[PDB]
Amino acid sequence: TRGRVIQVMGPVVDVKFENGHLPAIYNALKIQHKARNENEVDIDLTLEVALHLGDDTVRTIAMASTDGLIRGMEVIDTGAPISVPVGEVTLGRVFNVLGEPIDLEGDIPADARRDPIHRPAPKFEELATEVEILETGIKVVDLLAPYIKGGKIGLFGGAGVGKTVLIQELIHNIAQEHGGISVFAGVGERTREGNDLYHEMKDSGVISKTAMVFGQMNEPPGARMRVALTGLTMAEYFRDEQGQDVLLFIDNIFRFTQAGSEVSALLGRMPSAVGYQPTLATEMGQLQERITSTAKGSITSIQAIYVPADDYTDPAPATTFSHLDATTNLERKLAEMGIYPAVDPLASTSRALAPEIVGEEHYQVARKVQQTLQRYKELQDIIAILGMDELSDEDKLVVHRARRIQFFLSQNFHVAEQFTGQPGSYVPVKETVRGFKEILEGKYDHLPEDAFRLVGRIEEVVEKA
Amino acid sequence: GAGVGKTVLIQELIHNIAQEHGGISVFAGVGERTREGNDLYHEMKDSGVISKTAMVFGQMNEPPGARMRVALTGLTMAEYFRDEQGQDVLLFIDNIFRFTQAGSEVSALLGRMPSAVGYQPTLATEMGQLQERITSTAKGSITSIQAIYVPADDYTDPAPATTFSHLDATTNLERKLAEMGIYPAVDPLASTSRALAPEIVGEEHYQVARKVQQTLQRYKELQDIIAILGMDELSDEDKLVVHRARRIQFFLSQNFHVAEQFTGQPGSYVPVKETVRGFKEILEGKYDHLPEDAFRLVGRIEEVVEKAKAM
Amino acid sequence: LLDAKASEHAARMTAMKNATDNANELIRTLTLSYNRARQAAITQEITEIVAGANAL
Amino acid sequence: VGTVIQVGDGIARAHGLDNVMSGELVEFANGVMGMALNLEENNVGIVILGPYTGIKEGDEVRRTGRIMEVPVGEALIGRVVNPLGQPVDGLGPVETTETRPIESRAPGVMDRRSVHEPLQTGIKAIDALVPIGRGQRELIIGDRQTGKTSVAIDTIINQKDQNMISIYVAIGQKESTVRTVVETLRKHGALDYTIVVTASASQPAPLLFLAPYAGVAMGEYFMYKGKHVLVVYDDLSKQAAAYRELSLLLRRPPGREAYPGDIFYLHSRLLERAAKLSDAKGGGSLTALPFVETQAGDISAYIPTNVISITDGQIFLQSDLFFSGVRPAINAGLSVSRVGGAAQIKAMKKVAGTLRLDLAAYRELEAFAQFGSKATQAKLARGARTVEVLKQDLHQPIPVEKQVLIIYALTRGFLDDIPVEDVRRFEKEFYLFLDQNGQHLLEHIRTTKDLPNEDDLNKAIEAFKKTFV
Amino acid sequence: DVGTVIQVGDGIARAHGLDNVMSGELVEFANGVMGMALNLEENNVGIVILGPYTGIKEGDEVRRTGRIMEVPVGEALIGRVVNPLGQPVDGLGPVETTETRPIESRAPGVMDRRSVHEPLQTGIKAIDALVPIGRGQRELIIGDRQTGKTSVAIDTIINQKDQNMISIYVAIGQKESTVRTVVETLRKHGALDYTIVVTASASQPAPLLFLAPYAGVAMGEYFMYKGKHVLVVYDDLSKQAAAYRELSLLLRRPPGREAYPGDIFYLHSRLLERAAKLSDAKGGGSLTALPFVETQAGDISAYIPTNVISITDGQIFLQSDLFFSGVRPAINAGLSVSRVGGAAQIKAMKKVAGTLRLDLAAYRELEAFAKATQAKLARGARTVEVLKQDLHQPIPVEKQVLIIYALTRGFLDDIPVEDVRRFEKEFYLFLDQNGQHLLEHIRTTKDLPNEDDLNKAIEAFK
Amino acid sequence: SKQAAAYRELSLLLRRPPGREAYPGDIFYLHSRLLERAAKLSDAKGGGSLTALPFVETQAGDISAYIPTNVISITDGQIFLQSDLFFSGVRPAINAGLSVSRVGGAAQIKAMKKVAGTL
Ligand SMILES: Nc1ncnc2c1ncn2[C@@H]1O[C@H](COP(=O)(O)OP(=O)(O)NP(=O)(O)O)[C@@H](O)[C@H]1O
Ligand SMILES: Nc1ncnc2c1ncn2[C@@H]1O[C@H](COP(=O)(O)OP(=O)(O)NP(=O)(O)O)[C@@H](O)[C@H]1O
Ligand SMILES: Nc1ncnc2c1ncn2[C@@H]1O[C@H](COP(=O)(O)OP(=O)(O)NP(=O)(O)O)[C@@H](O)[C@H]1O
Ligand SMILES: [Mg+2]
Ligand SMILES: [Mg+2]
Ligand SMILES: [Mg+2]
């Protein structure tokens, strides 16, 4: 027998199941309603079980708008958590949290297999025992902060400084150089900016190689928490059954923790320190621990970060940061000079840059870049007020080398074509070490520094000069 | 805040205004001390204003039920005087904060949950039903003065935040000015009014007021820089700002008429024309060589040259 | 006098270079104290609110 | 039909009402309306929209059988109305025939369109440095004073030539203030294209809770019929207060500062409704300017950071600069627009870069570099003259064309010979000079929305500077 | 001995019936997961679930294990990675252990203890040289994140092969990548054939994270009570404190400062007072523990760091500003103390190099202000350089004290700073072919050799 | 202050909800019941005098706390004893800037008016 509603309080709804045939926790329940007369309103809400309460009573949190419910109406059972279709049908399309697509390109048929969201994490005996460095082909990123297959990377930057093109470059590079599938998830993101992102993807021909999930801000907190785990299934199924490196972009982890805060306040749990849920350290961990690398493939994630009041000691940044393996920054003061991308070479850090992982020569060449850029970073203040020619030989050579490491950072990308016509180039990881070693010795000091702008190989730099 | 000087100014107001204004005067006390309330009745019986004034009391020694309605009793009188008889009315209401505070103490027993700092959840609903009753209408004009006590000398408190939305002109008092010994303790920076418009006060008012306000805002950070950087490391042009702002702030003090007990002095009287005139002179540079201490607790500018003569 | 006037500006340079440092440490430690005071205030406020809610 | 059991502070709990839906209207014998917000097992929580002193236990409550409806119509323009469909100014009925539900769904992602057409208010600072498009939502956050209402009044008044049906809402404010604002507007005839929604303090907090929903419901009809709509809020944070009160009286579990967690939902369910619609439904557009209260500039507070996440930008107003001379106190450091750079006339885009190359350096260097007396002092002097020229006097909106003319005059370097105090005179006597010099430049900017020939543009400046006194 | 479950909320359950249930008893659900009873009301029992609770429904049958919180122990767990409940992690068949220990057992007390005079050979120069440790001592490892705390524990546990000490490594709330990297390092070096690794990852429920150290010490003390020596390490106590806050706030207890309940001083004590050096009534074995605490902002004055300090006998506070300065491990010569006297070290150490702490702390303070002081400054750079070491290079204790003697006696004043670390690697290549006798003398007599011969050895190298 | 703590801990076990602190909100009422009991009666009543000298302690000398500010609102003045002047050698350490007395020169011998009325 289908469940019956006896209690409604805004986003939170209680259900009843007679005879004790209750469903499981984190299951999905659906309601189908239509007005029999003008005295009723249509609604197709769905609910997720979160708690049992005894006397055949269950608590549920709403996934959409919940107005118009009536005592005595019926809610049907599904027997499994929310399920998303997986396979070839997922690529090139945008879906909501529940699964239905948001575009007008039709539905998805019922014969495709569907995978659940809530599943146990991969076990101990299935993890990869080697630090396999993912190859990105981006000149600065492959040098100062190598990415680890199965690890996590955070992004910081100024307002609007290329925060979206650096994501769309990676999908194209993954498709071109190694081949793979990428998923973009929006955690409670704006409905307006989805259109901008969709069109900027479409004019680049990149949406065809990625799958996307949106949860809008007008959605209740019950659905805004589930979007990341929803996209995780699509990311995982291609690493499980097919096998290749997969990317999973998460737009903002802050709103994930904040949705956790909202739903915990709604669930009746007493606020923990600073008002968060008591289960803050375990509800986040279930997301971070599914993104791993087995012996056959990997899921790697890129995440942007917000801070509540620049308080790193706040529980959310404190619990997030330890789970991150790399972090890079973008500065607007360099973007004003046109150095795309304007990645900070000093605020970017990663745990992988160790001699045991990358070898002796690549470690030396990666660390000495930061060592030698510090002289410029400190002398820029006195340079800004007095001329260079009166200084010592050390300041001159520092400026002379730093003006080339400063401009070598740039590289033309494949997405850049629709506003600056360029073929698009790639930086080999083995060649990057040779190139930076040769520059840092001063073998290319005679080239004009601004000629070093926007390209991905030193040999092309030589040709252009 | 606590012990800043509200009552001396409010009694100066009822001394100066009610003695001349022919409107029916009502003074209502909500949260002050009983001794002041008992002294004021005898002072009224001597002043001759008793013929044209009524009073309501009950003060602190009673539970919240009386301290809530004692504010509205005087308004209930002023309402009949305005709506039917039609003469002008003066309404002084003293420490309406305790109307709010009383509502807290019963709230915990009435079944309402606490909120924020601890005030009852019905702050706005209870307060609006009072603050919108005292209004001027087309039939009659009501002039109303109120006293507000900040709960902890800090303004980011829900009670002052809720009270700030109904006043037409507010004057703030800072306990720092109380400790500086320059009375009254009105801080010029945060004191604002709807009257500062060109069509009401004229152009001779606006420019001088804005210049004085801007200079007193500018001095605020330079005086803090002085606390560390020294006293002559700052440029002489910067030091002139302090050199004149000190005089400007000192001349703001006034010797009141109701403070004769605390001062031992009869005071002095100034019209507004002399105030605008004196500020124009102090900005003109006519008084650069008179000592700052000569400007403490004086009225008309003409007194200052006498006090220097006294020194 | 020229030598002394040059050494004077050198000494002033050194004085400002020492003076400009401890400020940042003092700001960072006060800012930490500020977040701790915040967190303590919010925690105390929620604890009082939830105790009142449980009582009533 | 059912019976009332508990009454207090405008909240009631009733027994009965078997088939009452969430959000359904209910009525009492006294004639005051009520809204059902909580549905428990044996009681229904009714929140009352009017004076409750006359309701007694044992009174009968009747189900209306319909959701909230708000009448709309073009004839309403000029009339002042309650958030509910009742006349407050008198003068007979409201002259409406069609009624809209308040629960209209927000437009989908495929029903929208990029925005590049601007909105104007007449202020050099906001209209240029923090631009707003005709599909944008922009946030204004601040404490009391600092001149937030002036922004709304300029946004409403300046929309004379450019069609825009406007709705100003004043929530929980004293009625004398709203009447004064209405009369000040009446001096400029703004009532011909404006609608005002007021819910006074004496009115129950539920009206404050419902006011902005009506301030969008009354404004979306011109959109969906193909007209351009603007909506402005006097203060939106007061929502929370009302939402606190009822929610606390209804015994919903507390939150961080007694704000229940629904705030993000409650705001968003409104603020997402502003959009630039597509041609499949109608080519209308709507823009909104929410307002937020703040205690002494504590931007890190709950509600301010809550509302910042939704909007496409922020305009914070800073109080200690409010007395420096620049009014309204918009700071170029804290305020950025993500949509900006597209919704401009191309005359503006060609020049604003140099304006930033002066101002962004001045607004960070002045505080410490001002004491030490060629290029650096030139930067300092130029920045001083820029921050002087951005000021404006009380309620003198300027058309876009004169704004771009003066910005071009400032940035090109022809303006820095007039001394610091006389700039306020110069910026106006230029305005008077241009009309007697010619209208052709003004006509070209009006028609083509592009800067005219610079070789001819410079001649007006050159001729003026020869006669300036 | 039957009943039904009526609440399944958030990993906590309530059960009807269960007339004979005792406090602290193990319980099994019909789904196949273990739980435990902590509270017994008038007509219901509170149960805490130790696994995946998504499979529990109302009306499920629940059953009595019949005994207190016993974890299996013995030699069969050696060579395996095990769950705290007593289940192998990497397969390799079921365990054969028969004997068990209750992890709530009463700790040994008065007339069962003895002083400490023998060292725990760590092989990390800067620790044993400045902050010595002895068996039976409890030393706090506390500090900031991303600075290298685990790299200390791994080196300390690899160096224990020559002392024949069965040991346990405990991982709490940790990422499996580092866990398996550590396990691969141990299996490569062979430490898994006498060490036991217990893990409870971040994707596991809070109660397992809360119980893990109790099992980690219960499976370790068993070898003590039989006369063997044991070393036990915990990966993080901060995560255990957070899990306890989570559990308590779900249980609706009144929070205190920073929402941490008042049982914090109790919970940890019942965990950390199990370490002891037994008297002759049981045997001469001893156990030493190295718990880990992570500071949110590197400020010592917080609640948990001070409460955890209150029990332990010392602490080493790992800093982050030292991490980027080119020094590893980040060991501060200032606020870090051990209460054991200098006699715990071999007599040569106290005889000669006991002044290292003063020589280094004085320089670490004096550099901030920076002929006699000019000469003093020259020694500090060598004092910090010689103490440096790289990953997986545990120096033998005889060569360790020999190089410390060379440093403390001023033999290195000619060597330039940048070349100091070269001398250290070449010097050991010298002695094995010229001074082989001194190592055996050091190993046997526990005392410094003849001073004349030791002084004569060095001039040949120089 | 210990009497306030005693009232707080008396109220708590009675099952009465707390307020701004552990201190209940009735504290002001209690003090209003106490301090107002004094009076300087008139000639038709007997002409006596009952004056009180209450003492209040606060943590770390925080005059802005709940109990100090609550107490100040009732009394006719305050003598503020500041701990950091105590050791400097000013005994008693009365702060001449912050202390206030409301009755002023009403009850004082007329010799002091001529000399130190405004000192
Ligand atoms: N002109 C003055 N010269 C000297 N002392 C003054 C002057 N004006 C006020 N005072 C002192 O300031 C005190 C202020 O008293 P009062 O106005 O009652 O405090 P308050 O601001 O009202 N705080 P409260 O009464 O608790 O609401 C007086 O009692 C005097 O001691
Ligand atoms: N550009 C300006 N120049 C000078 N004064 C201004 C300017 N804009 C606004 N004002 C002042 O603004 C005042 C009106 O009150 P205002 O400061 O706008 O109230 P608000 O708190 O900012 N908004 P509201 O919440 O509705 O009261 C008038 O007294 C004006 O003098
Ligand atoms: N003594 C050392 N010398 C050189 N490199 C070291 C040393 N200790 C650690 N490292 C390197 O630095 C990395 C960080 O060490 P690690 O032990 O993982 O830190 P951690 O204690 O795990 N930080 P956390 O996870 O926050 O507790 C290691 O993986 C090594 O590559
Ligand atoms: Mg007073
Ligand atoms: Mg206003
Ligand atoms: Mg670690």
CSV table of N, CA, C and O in Angstrom, one decimal, chain E residues 242-277:
chain,number,residue,atom,x,y,z
E,242,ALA,N,36.4,15.2,17.5
E,242,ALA,CA,35.3,15.6,16.7
E,242,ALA,C,34.2,14.6,16.5
E,242,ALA,O,33.0,14.9,16.6
E,243,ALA,N,34.6,13.3,16.4
E,243,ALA,CA,33.6,12.3,16.3
E,243,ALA,C,32.8,12.1,17.6
E,243,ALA,O,31.6,11.9,17.6
E,244,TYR,N,33.5,12.3,18.8
E,244,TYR,CA,32.8,12.3,20.1
E,244,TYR,C,31.8,13.5,20.2
E,244,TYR,O,30.7,13.4,20.7
E,245,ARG,N,32.2,14.7,19.7
E,245,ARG,CA,31.3,15.8,19.7
E,245,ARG,C,30.1,15.5,18.8
E,245,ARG,O,28.9,15.8,19.2
E,246,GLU,N,30.3,14.9,17.6
E,246,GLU,CA,29.2,14.5,16.8
E,246,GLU,C,28.2,13.5,17.5
E,246,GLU,O,27.0,13.7,17.5
E,247,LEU,N,28.8,12.5,18.1
E,247,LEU,CA,28.0,11.5,18.8
E,247,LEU,C,27.2,12.2,20.0
E,247,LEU,O,26.0,11.9,20.2
E,248,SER,N,27.9,13.0,20.8
E,248,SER,CA,27.2,13.6,21.9
E,248,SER,C,26.1,14.6,21.5
E,248,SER,O,25.0,14.6,22.1
E,249,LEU,N,26.4,15.4,20.4
E,249,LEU,CA,25.3,16.3,20.0
E,249,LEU,C,24.1,15.5,19.4
E,249,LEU,O,23.0,16.0,19.5
E,250,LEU,N,24.4,14.4,18.7
E,250,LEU,CA,23.2,13.5,18.4
E,250,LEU,C,22.5,13.0,19.6
E,250,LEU,O,21.3,12.8,19.5
E,251,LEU,N,23.2,12.7,20.7
E,251,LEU,CA,22.6,12.2,21.9
E,251,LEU,C,21.9,13.3,22.7
E,251,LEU,O,21.4,13.0,23.8
E,252,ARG,N,22.0,14.6,22.3
E,252,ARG,CA,21.3,15.7,23.0
E,252,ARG,C,21.9,15.9,24.4
E,252,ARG,O,21.2,16.0,25.4
E,253,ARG,N,23.3,16.0,24.5
E,253,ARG,CA,23.8,16.5,25.8
E,253,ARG,C,24.2,18.0,25.7
E,253,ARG,O,24.4,18.5,24.6
E,254,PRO,N,24.1,18.6,26.8
E,254,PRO,CA,24.4,20.1,26.9
E,254,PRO,C,25.8,20.4,26.5
E,254,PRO,O,26.8,20.0,27.2
E,255,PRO,N,26.1,21.1,25.4
E,255,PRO,CA,27.4,21.5,25.0
E,255,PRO,C,28.1,22.5,26.0
E,255,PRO,O,27.4,23.2,26.6
E,256,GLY,N,29.4,22.4,26.0
E,256,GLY,CA,30.2,23.4,26.8
E,256,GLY,C,30.9,24.4,25.9
E,256,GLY,O,30.4,24.8,24.9
E,257,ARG,N,32.1,24.7,26.3
E,257,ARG,CA,32.9,25.6,25.5
E,257,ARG,C,33.3,24.9,24.1
E,257,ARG,O,33.8,23.8,24.1
E,258,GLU,N,33.1,25.6,23.0
E,258,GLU,CA,33.3,25.1,21.7
E,258,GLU,C,32.5,23.8,21.4
E,258,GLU,O,32.9,22.9,20.7
E,259,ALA,N,31.4,23.7,22.1
E,259,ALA,CA,30.4,22.6,21.9
E,259,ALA,C,31.0,21.2,22.4
E,259,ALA,O,30.3,20.2,22.2
E,260,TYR,N,32.2,21.2,22.9
E,260,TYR,CA,32.8,19.9,23.3
E,260,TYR,C,32.3,19.6,24.7
E,260,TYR,O,32.4,20.4,25.6
E,261,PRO,N,31.7,18.4,24.9
E,261,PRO,CA,31.1,18.0,26.2
E,261,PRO,C,32.2,17.8,27.2
E,261,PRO,O,33.4,17.7,26.9
E,262,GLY,N,31.8,17.8,28.5
E,262,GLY,CA,32.7,17.8,29.6
E,262,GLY,C,33.4,16.5,29.8
E,262,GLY,O,34.3,16.4,30.6
E,263,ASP,N,33.0,15.4,29.1
E,263,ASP,CA,33.6,14.1,29.2
E,263,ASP,C,35.0,14.0,28.5
E,263,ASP,O,35.6,13.0,28.5
E,264,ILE,N,35.5,15.1,27.9
E,264,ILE,CA,36.7,15.1,27.1
E,264,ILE,C,37.9,14.7,28.0
E,264,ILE,O,38.7,13.8,27.6
E,265,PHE,N,38.0,15.3,29.2
E,265,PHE,CA,39.1,14.9,30.1
E,265,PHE,C,38.9,13.5,30.6
E,265,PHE,O,39.9,12.8,30.9
E,266,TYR,N,37.7,13.0,30.6
E,266,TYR,CA,37.4,11.6,31.0
E,266,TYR,C,37.7,10.6,29.9
E,266,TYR,O,38.6,9.7,30.1
E,267,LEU,N,37.1,10.8,28.7
E,267,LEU,CA,37.3,9.9,27.6
E,267,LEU,C,38.7,9.6,27.3
E,267,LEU,O,39.1,8.4,27.2
E,268,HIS,N,39.5,10.6,27.2
E,268,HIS,CA,40.9,10.5,26.8
E,268,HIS,C,41.7,9.8,28.0
E,268,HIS,O,42.6,9.0,27.7
E,269,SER,N,41.4,10.1,29.2
E,269,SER,CA,42.1,9.5,30.3
E,269,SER,C,41.9,8.0,30.3
E,269,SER,O,42.9,7.2,30.4
E,270,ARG,N,40.7,7.5,30.3
E,270,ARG,CA,40.4,6.1,30.2
E,270,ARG,C,41.1,5.5,29.0
E,270,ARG,O,41.2,4.2,28.9
E,271,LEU,N,41.6,6.3,28.0
E,271,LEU,CA,42.4,5.8,26.9
E,271,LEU,C,43.9,5.9,27.2
E,271,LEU,O,44.6,5.0,26.8
E,272,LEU,N,44.3,6.9,27.8
E,272,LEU,CA,45.8,7.2,27.9
E,272,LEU,C,46.4,6.7,29.2
E,272,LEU,O,47.6,6.7,29.3
E,273,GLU,N,45.6,6.3,30.2
E,273,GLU,CA,46.2,5.8,31.5
E,273,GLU,C,46.5,4.3,31.4
E,273,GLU,O,46.9,3.8,32.4
E,274,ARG,N,46.2,3.7,30.3
E,274,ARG,CA,46.6,2.3,30.1
E,274,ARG,C,48.1,2.0,30.0
E,274,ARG,O,48.5,0.9,30.3
E,275,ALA,N,48.8,3.0,29.6
E,275,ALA,CA,50.3,2.8,29.5
E,275,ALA,C,50.9,2.8,30.9
E,275,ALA,O,50.6,3.6,31.7
E,276,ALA,N,51.8,1.8,31.0
E,276,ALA,CA,52.5,1.7,32.3
E,276,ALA,C,53.7,0.8,32.1
E,276,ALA,O,53.9,0.1,31.1
E,277,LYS,N,54.6,0.8,33.1
E,277,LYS,CA,55.7,-0.2,33.2
E,277,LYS,C,55.5,-1.1,34.3
E,277,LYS,O,55.7,-0.7,35.5
